């Protein structure tokens, strides 16, 4: 391969960024998969986009990036697929989801379900294999849970579903429904957009929280009825304090484990509420911003005194568990690194500060600026 981007330039100090030699996978350093073909992530230049992961066209050029991850499989059913006319999921049949991103049309965990059906040769569903299924993050049609195995306590398997699109409803109005289950917190930590249709949380009855949500906030339409009905009365709920986390924003929660928060009383850490941040006390490294609680660069050096990060990204931070290099605190100092006008530089290694340049070719490890470097 000829060089992608540029090659170690010595002002930026990060193999940047243009041009030199071109690109290809067609076994020909030119440019660039003309009309025909796309381009791999790894600086190739292929055709048909590397199944995992997808295509994309920033700046009219057809790069092809990483799915991150699950990739996106849209599935269908129940009745039709797949699937085809069939009460709830069962039991069979649930297997037809492994790796469903999001799954057009509705979905019923009805209890003719785990019960098993004979009448149609169908073993009870295993609560286990109901975690199929956290691969799901969207629903075109609607959720409809009237069965749910009662030594569960939330809608766990449904913990990554982000969205209940419109798009069809249980009866001609009603997009999410959770009629009379045994659980105790909805457990819908990733659903914050019910596109359209109505929520009805009927007769749950050990069911705390789930009426602290400001529902309208998730509703992308006009007359969005949320009918919270016959449930665990909020004193029953106050008497345990299945109250939202102390640590939780005024906004809400869905369980009580802080992760179950809606937005945070203090700051957040990457999916779950937190006390305060670690920018000052080590542990993942850490440093605040926008109230999220981002870690530091791997190559930073902590401190009782100082803080360890002025921000995200490698360079800007307080010190260095591997030398330094202009701004850029390098993990391992470059050595044999080509090119730029054909040069495999070739830089190291003065103590206290950064790396200094070598003298021609030297694939061997060369010291000072003077001469005595390469025998």
């Amino acid at each position, epitope marked *: 391969t000829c060089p992608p981007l540029m090659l170690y330039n010595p002002t930026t100090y990060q193999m940047d960024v243009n041009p030199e030699g071109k690109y290809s996978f067609g076994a020909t350093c030119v440019k660039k998969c003309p009309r025909n073909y796309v381009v791999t992530d790894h600086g190739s230049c292929v055709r048909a986009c590397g199944a995992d992961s997808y295509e994309m066209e920033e700046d009219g050029v057809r790069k092809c990036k990483k799915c991150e991850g699950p990739c996106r499989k849209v599935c269908n059913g129940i009745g039709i697929g797949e699937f085809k006319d069939s009460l709830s999921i069962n039991a069979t049949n649930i297997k037809h989801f492994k790796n469903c991103t999001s799954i057009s049309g509705d979905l019923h965990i009805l209890p003719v379900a785990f019960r098993g059906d004979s009448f149609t040769h169908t073993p009870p569903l295993d609560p286990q294999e109901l975690d199929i299924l956290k691969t799901v993050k969207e629903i075109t049609g609607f959720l409809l849970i009237q069965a749910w195995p009662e030594n569960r306590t939330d809608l766990h398997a449904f913990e990554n579903l982000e969205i209940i699109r419109g798009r069809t409803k249980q009866h001609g109005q009603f997009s999410l429904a959770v009629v009379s289950l045994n659980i105790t917190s909805l457990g819908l930590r990733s659903l914050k957009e019910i596109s359209d249709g109505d929520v*009805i949380i009927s007769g749950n009855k050990n069911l705390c929280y789930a009426n602290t949500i400001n529902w309208k906030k998730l509703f992308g339409t006009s007359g969005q009825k949320t009918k*919270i009905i016959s449930n665990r*009365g*909020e004193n029953s709920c106050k008497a345990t304090g299945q109250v939202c986390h102390a640590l939780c924003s005024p906004e809400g929660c869905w369980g009580p484990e802080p992760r179950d928060c809606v937005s945070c009383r203090n700051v957040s850490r990457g999916r779950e509420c937190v006390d305060k941040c670690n920018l000052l006390e080590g542990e993942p490294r850490e440093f605040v911003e926008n109230s999220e609680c981002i870690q530091c660069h791997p190559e930073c050096l902590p401190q009782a005194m100082n803080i360890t990060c002025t921000g995200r990204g490698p360079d800007n931070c307080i010190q260095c568990a591997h030398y330094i290099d202009g701004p850029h605190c390098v993990k391992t100092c470059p050595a044999g690194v080509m090119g730029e006008n054909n040069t495999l530089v070739w830089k190291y290694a003065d103590a206290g500060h950064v790396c200094h340049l070598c003298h021609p070719n030297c694939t061997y490890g060369c010291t000072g600026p003077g001469l005595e470097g390469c025998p």
Partner: T-cell receptor, first 113, second 108 residues
Framework: QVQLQESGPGLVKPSQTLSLTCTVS??????????WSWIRQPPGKGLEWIGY?????????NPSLKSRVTMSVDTSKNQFSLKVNSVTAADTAVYYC?????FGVGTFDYWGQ | EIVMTQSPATLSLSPGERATLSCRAS??????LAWYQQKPGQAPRLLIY???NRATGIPARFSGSGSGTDFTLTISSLEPEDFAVYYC?????????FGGGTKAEIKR
């Protein structure tokens, strides 16, 4: 079309047990569209709600009634049924069986006789 | 439980005149509330559910009204054939409770 005839014992001896049976004319007890329920009304008074049962376990009964009731559902004769055990002096009343609609009105809409 | 307190017990009124009825719920039943009508010998007849809407069809004169903890039954202009005891009936939080009543008698 639908209707909830209450049926069985006129008299019950105290410390003995009440059981009654409701039933279900023009509709298939076994569907999630309905809680089937019971309320009773001590003669000369307000209604008191007892408990109910969905077409899969899930009963919920009235704490008031102190663990005595349970509900259940013979699907043969397409009905569902009370028992209150430990019936007392103050258990004496009128038991209504009735239907709730979840998706409609969330409420009692058809009571039997 | 979560007490409905219908008031005021007893209301004699006389034809085409406005009748005004009410629970105060002990804690907020949001809107989850329905009104009923026990005419002797039979019983109940749901009339309004949620505040607010009349089932189908109760007579348009039947009206209510209310959210939070205080709601109101307004029979608009009373028949004789409005002789019943009328009932509150919440469904927000188990246990379901009804109110006290109001016996509504019409003066001839």
């Amino acid at each position: 079309q639908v209707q909830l005839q209450e049926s069985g014992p006129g008299l019950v001896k105290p410390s003995q047990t009440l059981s009654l049976t409701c039933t279900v004319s023009g509709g298939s007890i076994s569907s999630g569209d309905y809680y089937w329920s019971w309320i009773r009304q001590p003669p000369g008074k307000g209604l008191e709600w007892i408990g109910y049962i969905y077409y899969s376990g899930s009963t919920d009964y009235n704490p008031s009634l102190k663990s005595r009731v349970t509900m259940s559902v013979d699907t043969s004769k397409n009905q569902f049924s009370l028992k209150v055990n430990s019936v007392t002096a103050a258990d004496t009343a009128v038991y209504y069986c009735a239907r709730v609609s979840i998706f409609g009105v969330g409420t009692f809409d058809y009571w039997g006789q | 439980e979560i007490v409905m307190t219908q008031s005021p017990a007893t209301l004699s009124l006389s034809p085409g005149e406005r009748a005004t009825l009410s629970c105060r719920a002990s804690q907020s039943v949001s809107s989850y509330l329905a009104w009923y009508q026990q005419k002797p010998g039979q019983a109940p007849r749901l009339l309004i559910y949620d505040a607010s809407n009349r089932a189908t069809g109760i007579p348009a004169r039947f009206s209510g009204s209310g959210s939070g903890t205080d709601f109101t039954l307004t029979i608009s202009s009373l028949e004789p054939e409005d002789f019943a005891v009328y009932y509150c009936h919440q469904y927000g939080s188990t246990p379901l409770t009804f109110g006290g009543g109001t016996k509504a008698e019409i003066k001839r």
